Amino acid sequence: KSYTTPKKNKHKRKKVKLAVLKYYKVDENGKISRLRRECPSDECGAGVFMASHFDRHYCGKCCLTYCF
Amino acid sequence: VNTALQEVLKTALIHDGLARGIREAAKALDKRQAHLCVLASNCDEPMYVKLVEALCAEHQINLIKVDDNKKLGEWVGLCKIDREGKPRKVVGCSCVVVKDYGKESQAKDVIEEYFKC
Ligand SMILES: [Zn+2]
């Protein structure tokens, strides 16, 4: 059957090259500094980092929002 | 000790202990369950190798250095299809962290003593 409204194209989620490398910072010595925050929730305790948006941080696993 | 490393990682993947990937390695190191890790060299990795080495050197983990990525993929054995010889499509890998509960192996004991001494 013919249509009038054009079909709603699916969301093409873009890829990120070496997205893991954007969490920490590179130093020549044997020390670690973490850039973004980490979710203090129960299921994701100390391994899963949080999002870094333009106005608030977010974790999707437990739906935790940290507004400014 | 390379054969000890390959056997212990095969046991780890059999026992569903190890993790593979930069994201998985970071998760294991942050969860403080990591025991060993591997890293490749001579690649277009300006800050990748420095980042993972600092992660590995943060607190009490063993480091293994290798050259090639697809060879490391052969070391872990993720594409064992076409068993009658060479795997048809070898995949590459750089960072693999070994967490093992079935460490009752002479290979594990030898590599642990090698890192300790
Ligand atoms: Zn969370």
UniProtKB/Swiss-Prot annotation, chain A:
Post-translational modification: Monoubiquitinated at Lys-25 and Lys-31 by RNF25 in response to ribosome collisions (ribosome stalling): ubiquitination promotes subsequent activation of RNF14, leading to EEF1A1 ubiquitination and degradation and rescue of stalled ribosomes. Deubiquitination at Lys-31 by USP16 is required for maturation of the 40S ribosomal complex.
Function: Component of the 40S subunit of the ribosome. Part of the small subunit (SSU) processome, first precursor of the small eukaryotic ribosomal subunit. During the assembly of the SSU processome in the nucleolus, many ribosome biogenesis factors, an RNA chaperone and ribosomal proteins associate with the nascent pre-rRNA and work in concert to generate RNA folding, modifications, rearrangements and cleavage as well as targeted degradation of pre-ribosomal RNA by the RNA exosome.
Gene: RPS27A
Subunit structure: Part of the 40S ribosomal subunit. Part of the small subunit (SSU) processome, composed of more than 70 proteins and the RNA chaperone small nucleolar RNA (snoRNA) U3.
Zinc finger (C4-type): 39-62
Record localization: Cytoplasm; Nucleus, Nucleolus
Region of interest (Disordered), ranges: 1-13
Protein name as catalogued: Small ribosomal subunit protein eS31
Cross-link Glycyl lysine isopeptide (Lys-Gly) (interchain with G-Cter in ubiquitin) placement: K25, K31
Modified residues (N6-acetyllysine): K22, K31
Residues of the full protein shown: 83 to 150 of 156
UniProtKB/Swiss-Prot annotation, chain B:
Modification sites for N6-succinyllysine: K116
Top-level taxon: Eukaryota
A Pfam family per the record: Ribosomal_L7Ae
Primary location recorded for the protein, binned into one broad class: cytoplasm
Keyword Cytoplasm attached: yes
GO BP of this protein: positive regulation of canonical Wnt signaling pathway; ribosomal small subunit biogenesis; translation
GO cellular component, one term: nucleolus
Keywords: Acetylation, Cytoplasm, Nucleus, Ribonucleoprotein, Ribosomal protein
Example of a GO MF term: structural constituent of ribosome
Cysteine disulfide partners in this protein: none
Self-association state and partner proteins as the record states: Part of the small subunit (SSU) processome, composed of more than 70 proteins and the RNA chaperone small nucleolar RNA (snoRNA) U3. Subunit of the 40S ribosomal complex.
Family: Belongs to the eukaryotic ribosomal protein eS12 family.
Function: Part of the small subunit (SSU) processome, first precursor of the small eukaryotic ribosomal subunit. During the assembly of the SSU processome in the nucleolus, many ribosome biogenesis factors, an RNA chaperone and ribosomal proteins associate with the nascent pre-rRNA and work in concert to generate RNA folding, modifications, rearrangements and cleavage as well as targeted degradation of pre-ribosomal RNA by the RNA exosome. Subunit of the 40S ribosomal complex.
Name of the featured protein: Small ribosomal subunit protein eS12
Name of the gene this protein is made from: RPS12
